From Swiss-Prot, chain A:
GO annotation (BP), single: cytoplasmic actin-based contraction involved in cell motility
Annotated site, Interaction with Pro-rich sequence, chain positions: Y32
GO cellular component, one term: cytoplasm
Classification via Pfam families: Profilin
Region (Pro-rich sequence-binding) location: 2-7
Gene3D superfamilies found in the cross-reference section: Dynein light chain 2a, cytoplasmic
UniProt subunit comment: Binds actin.
Location(s), subcellular: Cytoplasm, Cytoskeleton
Name recorded for this polypeptide: Profilin
Length: 161, 160
């Protein structure tokens, strides 16, 4: 009637200088034995919740310095946005790009990005200009119609060269 | 006739778009832009949506973590790049003291913190690692807990 749970309770947890204590194997690094101070607040208290938990996934944050304009050039030049397209401080997720899309006699590269309850279109037109179109789902508009709206105006710009 | 006039007529008049701008293929910055407003709030800047000065932003990656490995990595490499993870809680790696002399025996002991608490890790010979938690809400602190951890560590070190 003496285990590890008893020994750490007597020589380490009894001082009430620790919240709990465990023993981890130098091999794998996982705790085989542990105690904690609980059961006074809640009888249904698992003290393994503190020392053990199976392999799960977590997010790691890095900081990168963004040039908003470059996020647009990289989309047409390279064909991706690893961090999304940034415009006016808002993050849009790069979804689709359709290269050499033919609309009424003219070719267009057109990209589509999404935000929460909205999104944007980017349309490369010749003469060296890019058309930017925003849409907002809260205003009963959508990407399909806004893309059509973008394409209709684009042809007009496309006529001037 | 300006740009804001031309896009208001050919694009926002369609009320299928929320706003529109055009970016030069050179720098990629919008020189001209329009948006739809004047109904809720008259005093709004329509550039807030299209332009913004070079700033810094956060990028998220996903990692699959094994908590045991996060304890080993502290001793093997000497810091914890992702913090030390135990029982689902992230502790921020602060200090590691190698070959600390406590009453005749040497110890490698690391200290980690979370909000209002923390933990100590002590490698003792014979191949065990001692893990000690402390909670500031229970009037405990890192120093006293390290001493308690260190003194108990001494006992296991004797049994080897």
């Amino acid at each position: 009637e003496y285990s590890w749970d008893s020994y750490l309770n007597d020589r380490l947890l009894a001082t009430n200088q620790v919240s709990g204590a465990g023993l981890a194997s130098e091999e794998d690094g996982v705790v085989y034995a542990c105690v904690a101070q609980g059961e006074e607040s809640d009888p249904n208290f698992d003290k393994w919740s503190l020392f053990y938990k199976e392999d799960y996934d977590i997010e790691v944050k890095t900081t990168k310095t963004i040039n908003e304009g470059q996020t647009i050039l990289v989309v047409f030049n390279e064909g991706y946005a690893p961090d999304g397209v940034w415009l006016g401080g808002t993050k849009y997720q790069f979804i689709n790009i359709e290269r050499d899309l033919e609309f009424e006699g003219y070719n267009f590269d057109v990209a589509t990005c999404a935000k929460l309850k909205g999104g944007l279109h980017l349309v490369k037109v010749p003469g060296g200009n890019i058309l930017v179109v925003l849409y907002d789902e809260e205003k009963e508009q959508d990407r399909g119609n806004s893309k059509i709206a973008a394409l209709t105006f684009a042809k007009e710009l496309a006529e001037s060269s």
